[PDB]
Structure formats: C-alpha cells, structure tokens
Amino acid sequence: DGAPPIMGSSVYITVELAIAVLAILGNVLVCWAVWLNSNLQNVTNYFVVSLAAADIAVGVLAIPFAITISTGFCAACHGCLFIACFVLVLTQSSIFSLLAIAIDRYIAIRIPLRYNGLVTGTRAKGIIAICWVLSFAIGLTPMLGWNNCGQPKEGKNHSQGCGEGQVACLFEDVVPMNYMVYFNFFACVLVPLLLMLGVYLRIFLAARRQLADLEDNWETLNDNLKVIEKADNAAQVKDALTKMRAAALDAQKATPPPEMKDFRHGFDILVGQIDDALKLANEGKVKEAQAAAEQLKTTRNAYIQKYLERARSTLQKEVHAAKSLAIIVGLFALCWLPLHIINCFTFFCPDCSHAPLWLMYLAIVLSHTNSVVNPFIYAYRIREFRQTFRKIIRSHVL
Numbered sequence: 390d391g392a393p394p395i396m397g398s399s400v401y402i403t404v405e406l407a408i409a410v411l412a413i414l415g416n417v418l419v420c421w422a423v424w425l426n427s428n429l430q431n432v433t434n435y436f437v438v439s440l441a442a443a444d445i446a447v448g449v450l451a452i453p454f455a456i457t458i459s460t461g462f463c464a465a466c467h468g469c470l471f472i473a474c475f476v477l478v479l480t481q482s483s484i485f486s487l488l489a490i491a492i493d494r495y496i497a498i499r500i501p502l503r504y505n506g507l508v509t510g511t512r513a514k515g516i517i518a519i520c521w522v523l524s525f526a527i528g529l530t531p532m533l534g535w536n537n538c539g540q541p542k543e544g545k546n547h548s549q550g551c552g553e554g555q556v557a558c559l560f561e562d563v564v565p566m567n568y569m570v571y572f573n574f575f576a577c578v579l580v581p582l583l584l585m586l587g588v589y590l591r592i593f594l595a596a597r598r599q600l601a602d603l604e605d606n607w608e609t610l611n612d613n614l615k616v617i618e619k620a621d622n623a624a625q626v627k628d629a630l631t632k633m634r635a636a637a638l639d640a641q642k643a644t645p646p647p648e649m650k651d652f653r654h655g656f657d658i659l660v661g662q663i664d665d666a667l668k669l670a671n672e673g674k675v676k677e678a679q680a681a682a683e684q685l686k687t688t689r690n691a692y693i694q695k696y697l698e699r700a701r702s703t704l705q706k707e708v709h710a711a712k713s714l715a716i717i718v719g720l721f722a723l724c725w726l727p728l729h730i731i732n733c734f735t736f737f738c739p740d741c742s743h744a745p746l747w748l749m750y751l752a753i754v755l756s757h758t759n760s761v762v763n764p765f766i767y768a769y770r771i772r773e774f775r776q777t778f779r780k781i782i783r784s785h786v787l
C-alpha cells in the first residue's frame with residue numbers, strides 16, 4: 390500500500406489544465422494577429438497559423454484526451470486507440486509545418502527573383518491541406534491494424550471490471566512500442582528533424598557566401614581603383630579597369646534585392662564611366678584615363694555604397710529571421726525527445742526496469758508545454774508580431 394493515487398493525479402490534472410489554458414490563449418493571439426495585420430499575411434505565416442492551430446487543438450482536445458487515458462478507464466479498444474493516438478496527428482502536423490517553413494526560407498534566400506512566382510498562397514494552402522491528411526494517416530496508423538487490441542491484458546481487464554470487447558485504456562497496452570520507436574520516432578520525427586537541421590545549415594551557408602561575394606566585389610572595386618592611381622602604364626590601367634568592370638557587372642546582377650530605378654541609374658553611371666576610361670586606355674591616354682577613373686569615386690560614394698549597405702542589411706535580416714524560426718525547431722525537439730528516448734529504453738532494454746510513473750508524466754507534461762512557447766518566441770524575436778500583439782492587447786483587452 391502507498392499514497393492514494395488521487396493525490397498525484399490531482400497534481401497532474403491541474404498542471405495539464407494550466408497548460409491547456411495558456412496554449413489556447415497564446416495561439417489564439419497568433420491567429421488573431423495574422424488575420425489583423427496584412428504585413429503578417431504571407432506564405433511563411435500560413436504555416437505559422439497551421440502550426441498555431443495544431444497547438445490550439447492540443448489544449449482543446451489532446452490534453453483532455455491525455456487526462457482521460459491516465460485513468461485507465463474501460464473502453465472499446467479502437468475507441469481507446471483514437472484517444473491514445475490523436476496527439477500523434479497534431480505532432481506530425483507540427484513537423485510538416487516546421488519543415489515547410491524551413492524550405493520556404495531556403496527558397497527565399499536561394500532564388501529570390503523566382504520566389505513569388507513559385508511559392509504562392511494557393512499552392513501553400515494546398516500543401517497545408519495535403520499535410521493535414523497525411524498527418525491523420527500517419528498518426529492513426531495503429532487503428533489500421535498495427536495495435537495490441539488482439540493481445541489484451543486480461544489481468545488488468547478483469548481487475549478494472551471491463552465488459553466484453555473492452556480493454557483498460559492504457560497507452561503502453563494498446564499502442565505497440567515498435568510502431569512508436571521505428572515508425573513514429575525514427576521515420577516520422579527523427580528523419581524530418583535532421584532534414585530541417587540540414588536545410589537551415591544550407592540557409593546560413595548561402596547567406597555567409599552571398600555576404601562574402603558582396604564584400605569581395607566591393608574591395609575589388611577599391612583595389613583596382615587605388616591601382617589606377619599608381620601605374621604609369623596605359624595597359625596596366627586598362628588591366629585594372631577590366632577586372633573592375635567584371636566586379637561591377639557582377640555586383641549589379643548579384644543583388645536586385647519596376648521600382649529600383651536608382652540601382653540601374655547608379656550602376657549605369659558606373660559601368661558607363663568605366664567604359665569611358667577604357668576607350669582612353671586603349672588609345673594610350675594614360676593620364677586622361679587616370680583622371681576619368683577618379684570620377685568613379687563619386688558614383689561609388691553616391692550610389693554603389695548605398696546598394697551594398699541595403700543588400701547587406703537585407704541578408705542580415707534574413708539570417709536573424711531564420712535564426713528565430715530555428716529556435717522554434719530546437720524547442721520542439723527539446724520538449725519531445727525525452728518521451729521518445731524513454732520509449733527507446735522501454736523497447737530496447739528489456740533488462741532495464743521501466744521508467745517510474747512520475748517521470749513518464751513529467752515527459753508527457755513537458756511535451757504539452759511546447760504548445761505554449763511559440764507565441765513567446767514570436768513576441769520576443771519578430772517585431773511585426775510584437776507590435777501587433779500590443780495593438781490587440783491594449784485595444785481589445787485594456
């Protein structure tokens with residue numbers, strides 16, 4: 390005999406209900422902000438809303454299901470399976486939304502000119518609907534036959550006094566552990582997580598490479614410039630002008646990120662001034678070419694230096710934003726890996742004693758807290774969400 394089980398159950402139920410309240414309120418706020426602000430109405434945030442909708446359903450459905458199944462109540466085994474497995478649908482939907490966000494940010498930084506013609510809202514909405522259908526198929530797969538309903542625990546069934554066709558509804562009695570470990574964890578969770586890690590790695594490498602190319606063109610522009618002011622040879626000045634023209638056409642085609650009329654004007658003055666200094670160089674007028682090339686220092690100061698700064702800050706904002714979204718993925722893995730790792734010990738080590746009950750429910754509670762944290766990450770790291778949060782709160786609550 391030990392402590393009455395209702396005492397520890399009261400702690401678990403209260404904590405679960407506290408999580409459900411916060412998960413609903415915070416993610417309702419996220420959906421409200423995107424509905425309200427057109428600046429937040431882009432393809433990237435449609436998956437953020439699909440992700441927020443999954444977390445609302447954790448508080449509205451998954452946590453009540455979790456409280457129910459903790460009692461071990463008698464139920465038809467396939468009704469028990471739906472109660473046990475529905476949270477796997479919502480978690481799989483979250484993985485699809487996170488994977489789509491990473492790929493979306495990869496397309497945006499790799500092919501900026503082709504982004505809006507390739508990634509549209511209509512295609513995004515279709516991708517979201519397909520991912521929700523696949524999430525139900527993956528998460529509810531044990532209902533298709535991969536379950537332990539055919540091997541019921543008759544000791545627990547008779548102890549709790551279940552009827553005919555009923556089982557004591559406990560998670561590890563109806564859901565097989567080889568599904569949870571091989572199918573759910575390895576194939577459906579671990580593999581997509583590693584792919585997300587690789588995509589974001591490709592995002593950060595692409596940004597670092599584009600910034601280096603921008604810096605390379607810039608110092609190449611100034612290096613040949615100081616070289617022209619030195620060489621007493623006309624061909625030596627022509628050499629610098631040619632390696633100066635390539636870096637000009639390079640940086641021009643490098644960063645367009647019509648309305649950018651200055652970018653064409655500022656670069657047409659530059660390339661046109663270089664071509665002028667070239668015709669002087671070919672005709673042997675060395676000091677006339679050196680004097681013409683000194684005009685570049687004005688076009689550079691009045692146009693080219695302004696495009697480099699605007700291009701660098703655009704890439705730094707993309708890095709900061711992809712860093713914000715990668716935190717979402719890291720907090721997801723942090724909240725869900727303990728449960729998966731416990732299942733591995735249960736499955737792979739039959740000589741190990743089972744993890745204690747209090748640790749099992751701490752891992753369950755921890756996985757539910759993930760449906761609370763994302764709105765905080767948005768509020769702290771994305772200014773457009775933070776500002777829209779204030780407007781909603783100050784005006785409609787206060």
Ligand SMILES: CC(C)CCC[C@@H](C)[C@H]1CC[C@H]2[C@@H]3CC=C4C[C@@H](O)CC[C@]4(C)[C@H]3CC[C@]12C
Binds near residue numbers: 464467468
């Ligand atoms: C629109 C929303 C609120 C619908 C909610 C659907 C939920 C509450 C319904 C749909 C299917 C239902 C389950 C289907 C069958 C069984 C087996 C029975 O032996 C115990 C009840 C149980 C486990 C039901 C519990 C309630 C249930 C899970």
Ligand SMILES: CC(C)CCC[C@@H](C)[C@H]1CC[C@H]2[C@@H]3CC=C4C[C@@H](O)CC[C@]4(C)[C@H]3CC[C@]12C
Binds near residue numbers: 726727731734741745
């Ligand atoms: C936070 C994330 C990244 C890491 C989480 C580490 C957790 C999940 C690990 C660290 C130590 C592990 C425990 C150490 C040893 C045992 C005893 C064994 O008989 C059952 C499993 C059990 C109880 C392990 C369960 C999982 C465990 C608690």
Ligand SMILES: CC(C)CCC[C@@H](C)[C@H]1CC[C@H]2[C@@H]3CC=C4C[C@@H](O)CC[C@]4(C)[C@H]3CC[C@]12C
Binds near residue numbers: 726730733734737
């Ligand atoms: C990036 C990381 C977190 C991926 C997940 C690592 C997992 C798959 C690894 C880390 C620690 C490992 C466990 C550590 C020790 C044991 C005890 C052994 O008797 C059975 C296997 C088992 C239970 C391992 C299973 C696999 C395991 C859980």
Ligand SMILES: Nc1nc(NCCc2ccc(O)cc2)nc2nc(-c3ccco3)nn12
Binds near residue numbers: 561569728732750
């Ligand atoms: N193993 C497990 N158990 C439970 N609940 C049952 C906890 C339990 C375990 C042993 C026992 O004797 C009584 C209760 N929920 C669970 N959820 C998950 C899970 C969801 C996603 C990944 O792992 N695993 N999981």
Ligand SMILES: CCCCCCCC/C=C\CCCCCCCC(=O)O
Binds near residue numbers: 522
């Ligand atoms: C627009 C977002 C919402 C998209 C529609 C969501 C509806 C998906 C519902 C059911 C999909 C069917 C897959 C269910 C698997 C069968 C298992 C079973 O029920 O026995």
Ligand code: NA
Binds near residue numbers: 443444479483759760
């Ligand atoms: Na989620």
